[PDB]
Structures are given as structure tokens and as C-alpha cells.
């Protein structure tokens, strides 16, 4: 909270200063320009102009004294030193020079979420974090007709939000003669022979859904670098800001597992959902991302009940257990003691699997993902420039991670660290947890699903990518410097798909021979 207010101030002031540089304008003009770019939705533009009204004169005075954003934000008291909270420097400065600058700033100012609108934004964000089910959902079946706030970006769109027995993944109601009860777009009678289309096209095709149990990576956490790069900034940079905020800065609709939109990169690789739908068009809309920022084996229990699958009335599902780093990645200064132990991981996963067995239809399939070896994050990025540092070449990822660490906001103290010993210990723990998951999958059995393990194998992805001409830093989210980006997520989903195809082809089911007839009769099946 102190960390978040400090970091927010430093980012905003940095963008203001860089916009003044890019346009060769005054700071007043740069601040007007920033606010002018923002959407009116969610009070974003209005909040910006209120901030400029409240703090703008002081920002002008301190940038006029050549203070950088970190000094400005301490002078303005958005950043504060405490007994167990040192002052955090984003830019390298001798201590004397930092203290002189901060004292000058404080002198300049002496000469002469409670805020309106921002409070509204803060409340809506908190509510989005707290809730794992859609806000708009008249019939309470957890599927929505709206995209964000845990709506159809996260799970198949509800084709009838006035009927809690109509939703994606349901076994059809007497072959869907009069209503498309399972939202796959297939319904009605073939006039040639009187046979219900859902019966002739889907009977015996063994439909199944895809369910992700995921973290921020799984939900495709992504802050557009366009929001922080003054050199290319305009109105069009922020058009996606309202939707991204109401999706908790996640983009599940573009994720490697549950993505259903056309990919940004346009690469061949498609999401697991897209491949399952392609294999059997009866599976149209049967995706769910049961994923939350910060999820780990320890706290998945706090939102897994948001999963929607009726054991008696729904088709089976492929369930991917993808707690792929927060059991080792944390923000505690003494970070190793905070990491999950193999014994804790065993207990936590067994509790999840026992819960799943009583909440999945029989015939389901559960795949446990191993944890990545994140040592290539530091290796790939530490000398490159962060988006906020690209204009003036003055913030490397090493400097960015050090700043976050000081603020207790670094998302992975163990891997995003200049300390090689610590990075090695973190990878060792991740491999021990992966071994625990592999032991569970090859030993424990459950009545309603079979159980499997797949390794994460980031090295396979980096090799695929380097073979195509790419570099490893291009696989990482530029703003957070931590999460796999959209490309990386899709490449990893491709590896997983192909492993399942070779190792356990029954998990994917058969290719439906009526796919082409489904498209001829129903087209896009109602879209997404």
C-alpha cells in the first residue's frame, strides 16, 4: 500500500517528465496532454485532471529543479521512509547527492484513494480482485453476457442469462430440439431426416471442456508498454485501459490455455481451447479460466469453488493445475523461508485433487504442470532497458527489480535478483516442488478423473524461439519483467498439447467427423 502509492507516483511523474521531453513542452502542457489521452470511462480522465489540479503545481516546481521522479515522490510524501522501510532510489545517485536533492525539494515546497474519483476507481478495482464470479449474471450460473468483471473473457458466454440450466459445458437437454441448452450453437432438427442436429453431430463425440486453475501467468497478466512509453503515446494507447482494469490486468481471452480471440502476434500457435474446439466443434464456448493473480498451491482453496461444473449434469473436463510459480515467487525480503516446502505442496495439492474429485463429472482428466526454471529471466533482462527507461537509457531491469525489492513489491525476490546463489536456490526449490507434483500424478488415483504430469520446460520454448530467429528477452512481459508474454504462453501450450497427443491421446478425445457439417449448418456457431 505504501509501496503501491510510491510506485504509482514514480510511474506517473516519469511519464509526465518524458512527455515534456518528447514534445519539447512545459510540464504543464505535458500534464494536460496526458489527461487528454485518457478514456472518459471509469472516471479515468476525470481522475487525472483532479490529480493535476491537486499536485500539478508542485510537480512543475520540482521538475523545474531537475528532480527525478523518485525524489519528487518522496518530497510529495507518496513515498516515505520508515523504521523498517528505507528510502528507495530508482536512479543511481551518491547518498549525499540524493539527500541534497531531497532537501532542496522539501525547501522548494515550503515556499508555498480518498480523493474524488480515484476513490471510485479504487473501490471498483478492489471488488474486481475480491470476486471470482461475474458481476453481471442474472441467473447465477457463473456465465455472463458481458466480457469483463469475470464475464465471458473468463468463461464461455451465456446464451441464456435467464435460465440457470442453460450454459456452456452442460449435457444437452434432450438433444437441444427447441433450445441450444449448452450454448455450443448446435440445436434444432435436420429437415432431411428429422434427427436432432446435436444428436447426429455430437452423440458419441465425447465432448469435454477446458478448465484452467491458474495464476497471473495463466490468466495472461499484461500491462501494455504503450501505457508507459511517452515516445509513442496517444489517445489510441489507452483505449484498452478500462477493459484491462476491469479484467484485473489479465487477458484470459488471449491466454495460451483459454484464449478464444485471434492472437496479437498472429503466429500459427493457437490456445488449448482453440485446438480442442477445432478437434470437436461440439466444444464451442466450453472454456473456464479459474485463475487469480497471486494464486499458489496454498491459496487456490480460497477461490476454487468459483469453478462451475455440475457432476451430474455437465460434460467432463480437462483440468490444468497450473500453479507455476507463486509457491517459490514472493515479496518477502527473507524469501526462501516463505517458499512452499515439498511436504506442504503435497498436502495442498492432495486437498485440491480430493475437492476436484467431488466436483468434476466422471471421465475428467487432470494434468499437473511442473514449475519453470526462472533463472533465464534475470539472465535475459538484467542489462536491458525497462520501458520507463528506454527514452533516456536510464532504467535497466536490474534497477527496476532493485527498486521493487526495496518497496517490497518485487513479484519474485528469488529469481529477479542480482544474487546468483539465491537464483540457484529458487530453481532448486522449484524443481523439488515439480518432483512432488510428478510423484503425486504417478502414484495417487481418484474415482472421477485420471491424473497426469507435464513439465514446464521453458528451455524448450527458448530453443523453439531461438530456432525461429528470436531472442529470449522477447518471451517476457516488458512492463513486469517476470511473466511469460502472449507468444511464450502460446508456445508452451503448443508443447503441452503435443505432449498430451503423444502420451495420452485419449485425453484429447477423437476428432469429430461431423466438424465440416457442423460448420455448414451453423457457421461460427454463434461466436464467442
Ligand X SMILES: CCCCCCCCCCCCCCCCCC(=O)OC[C@H](COP(=O)([O-])O)OC(=O)CCCCCCCCCCCCCCCCC
Ligand Y SMILES: *[C@@H]1O[C@H](CO)[C@@H](O[C@@H]2O[C@H](CO)[C@@H](O)[C@H](O)[C@H]2NC(C)=O)[C@H](O)[C@H]1NC(C)=O
Ligand Z SMILES: CCCCCCCCCCCCCC(=O)O
Residues of this chain that interact with ligand X (CB under 6 A) are: 4, 7-9, 11-12, 15, 51, 55, 78, 215-216, 221, 223, 227, 293-294, 326, 411, 479-480
CB 282, min distance to ligand NAG, A: 18
Ranked by CB distance to ligand X, the top (closest) residue is 8
For residue 210, give the 3-state DSSP assignment: strand
When binding is defined by CB under 6 A, the residue of 179, 299, 375, 515 that contacts ligand Y is 179
When binding is defined by CB under 6 A, the residue of 174, 419, 442, 503 that contacts ligand Y is 419
Interface with ligand Z includes 517 (CB under 6 A)? Answer: no
From the list Ca ion, ligand X, ligand Z, none, partner contacted by residue 44 (C-beta under 5 to 8 A by kind)? ligand Z
**In the window 129-158, what residues touch ligand Y (CB under 6 A)?**
none
Best CA proximity match to 39, nearest among 31, 48, 30 = 48
Cα–Cα–Cα angle for 480, 307, 214, nearest 5°?
A: 25
Kindly indicate which of the ranges 40-48, 97-105, 308-316, 369-377 contains the residues binding ligand Z, using the contact rule CB under 6 A: 40-48
Tell me, what DSSP letter sits at residue 254? G
How many residues line the site for ligand Z (CB under 6 A)? 12
Interface with ligand Z includes 44 (CB under 6 A)? Answer: yes
**In the window 484-503, what residues touch ligand Y (CB under 6 A)?**
none
Distance CA 481, CA 494 (A): 23
C-alpha to C-alpha distances, 326 to 311, 401, 500, 526, nearest whole angstrom: 30, 17, 25, 37
State which residue, 239 or 422, has the beta carbon closest to ligand Y: 422
From the list ligand Y, ligand X, Ca ion, none, partner contacted by residue 137 (C-beta under 5 to 8 A by kind)? Ca ion
CB 313, min distance to ligand Z, A: 33
Best CA proximity match to 330, nearest among 304, 302, 303, 296 = 296
Burial tier of 524 (Cβ tally within 10 Å: 0-12, 13-18, 19+): exposed
Q: Which residues contact 390 (CB under 8 A, 6 or more apart)?
A: 229, 231
Interacting residues toward ligand NAG by CB under 6 A: 362-363
Helix (H) or strand (E) holding 427: helix 420-441
From the list ligand Z, ligand NAG, ligand Y, none, partner contacted by residue 47 (C-beta under 5 to 8 A by kind)? ligand Z
State which residue, 167 or 452, has the beta carbon closest to Ca ion: 167
- All cell numbers assigned to 401: 527489480
When binding is defined by CB under 6 A, the residue of 24, 95, 162, 443 that contacts ligand Y is 162
State which residue, 60 or 425, has the beta carbon closest to ligand Y: 425
Distance CA 491, CA 462 (A): 9
From the list ligand X, ligand Y, ligand NAG, none, partner contacted by residue 487 (C-beta under 5 to 8 A by kind)? none
Interface with ligand Z includes 248 (CB under 6 A)? Answer: yes
- Determine how many CB atoms are found less than 10 A away from the CB of residue 211: 28
Interface with ligand Z includes 249 (CB under 6 A)? Answer: yes
DSSP string for residues in 451-465:
EEEE---HHHHHHHH
DSSP β-bridge partners for residue 396? 385
CB 249, min distance to ligand Z, A: 4
CB 260 within 8 A of CB 252: no
From the list ligand X, Ca ion, ligand NAG, none, partner contacted by residue 363 (C-beta under 5 to 8 A by kind)? ligand NAG
For residue 214, give the 3-state DSSP assignment: strand
Amino acid at each position: 500500500s505504501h509501496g503501491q502509492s510510491c510506485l504509482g507516483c514514480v510511474v506517473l511523474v516519469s511519464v509526465i517528465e518524458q512527455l515534456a521531453e518528447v514534445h519539447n513542452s512545459s510540464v504543464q502542457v505535458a500534464m494536460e496532454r496526458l489527461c487528454s489521452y485518457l478514456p472518459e470511462k471509469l472516471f479515468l480522465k476525470t481522475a487525472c485532471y483532479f490529480l493535476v489540479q491537486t499536485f500539478g503545481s508542485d510537480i512543475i516546481k520540482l521538475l523545474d529543479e531537475a528532480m527525478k521522479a523518485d525524489v519528487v515522490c518522496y518530497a510529495l510524501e507518496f513515498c516515505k521512509r520508515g523504521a523498517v522501510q528505507p528510502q528507495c532510489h530508482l536512479y543511481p545517485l551518491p547518498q549525499e547527492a540524493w539527500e541534497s536533492a531531497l532537501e532542496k525539494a522539501r525547501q522548494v515546497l515550503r515556499r508555498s484513494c480518498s480523493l474524488p474519483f480515484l476513490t471510485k476507481i479504487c473501490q471498483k478495482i478492489e471488488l474486481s480482485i475480491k470476486k471470482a464470479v461475474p458481476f453481471k449474471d442474472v441467473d447465477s450460473d457463473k456465465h455472463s453476457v458481458f466480457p469483463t468483471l469475470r464475464g465471458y473473457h473468463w468463461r464461455g458466454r451465456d446464451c441464456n442469462d435467464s435460465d440457470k440450466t442453460v450454459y456452456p459445458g452442460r449435457r444437452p437437454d434432450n438433444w437441444d430440439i427447441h433450445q441450444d441448452s449448452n450454448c455450443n450453437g448446435i440445436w434444432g432438427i435436420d429437415p432431411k431426416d428429422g434427427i436432432p442436429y446435436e444428436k447426429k453431430f455430437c452423440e458419441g463425440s465425447q465432448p469435454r471442456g477446458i478448465i484452467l486453475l491458474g495464476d497471473a501467468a495463466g490468466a495472461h497478466f499484461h500491462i501494455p508498454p504503450e501505457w508507459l512509453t511517452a515516445s509513442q503515446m496517444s489517445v489510441n494507447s489507452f483505449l484498452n485501459l478500462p477493459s484491462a482494469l476491469t479484467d484485473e490486468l489479465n487477458w484470459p481471452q488471449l491466454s495460451g490455455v483459454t484464449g478464444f480471440l485471434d492472437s496479437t502476434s498472429g503466429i500459427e500457435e493457437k490456445s488449448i481451447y482453440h485446438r480442442l474446439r477445432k478437434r470437436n466443434h461440439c466444444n464451442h464456448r466450453d472454456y473456464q479460466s479459474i485463475s487469480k493473480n497471486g494464486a499458489s498451491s496454498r491459496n487456490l482453496k480460497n477461490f476454487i469453488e468459483s469453478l462451475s461444473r455440475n457432476q451430474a449434469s455437465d460434460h467432463p473436463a480437462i483440468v490444468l493445475y497450473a500453479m507455476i510459480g507463486n509457491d517459490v515467487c514472493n515479496s518477502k525480503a527473507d524469501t526462501v523461508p516463505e517458499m512452499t516446502t515439498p511436504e506442504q505442496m503435497y498436502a495442498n495439492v492432495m486437498q485440491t485433487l480430493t475437492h476436484l474429485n467431488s466436483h468434476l463429472p466422471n471421465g475428467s482428466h487432470v494434468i499437473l504442470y511442473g514449475l519453470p526454471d526462472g533463472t533465464f529471466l534475470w539472465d535475459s533482462l538484467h542489462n536491458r532497458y525497462h520501458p520507463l527507461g528506454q527514452l533516456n537509457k536510464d532504467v535497466t531491469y536490474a534497477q527496476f527489480f532493485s527498486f521493487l525489492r526495496c518497496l517490497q513489491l518485487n513479484p519474485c525476490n528469488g529469481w529477479m535478483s542480482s544474487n546468483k546463489t539465491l537464483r540457484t536456490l529458487t530453481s532448486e526449490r522449484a524443481e523439488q516442488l515439480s518432483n512432488t507434483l510428478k510423484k503425486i500424478a504417478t502414484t495417487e488415483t481418484f474415482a472421477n478423473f485420471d491424473l497426469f504430469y507435464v513439465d514446464f520446460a521453458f528451455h524448450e520454448i527458448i530453443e523453439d524461439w531461438q530456432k525461429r530467429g528470436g531472442q529470449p528477452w522477447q518471451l517476457i512481459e516488458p512492463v513486469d519483467g517476470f511473466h511469460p508474454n502472449e507468444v511464450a504462453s502460446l508456445l508452451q501450450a503448443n508443447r503441452v498439447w503435443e505432449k498430451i497427443q503423444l502420451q495420452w491421446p485419449h485425453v484429447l478425445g477423437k476428432e469429430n467427423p461431423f466438424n465440416s457439417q457442423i460448420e455448414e449448418v451453423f457457421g461460427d456457431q454463434g461466436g464467442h
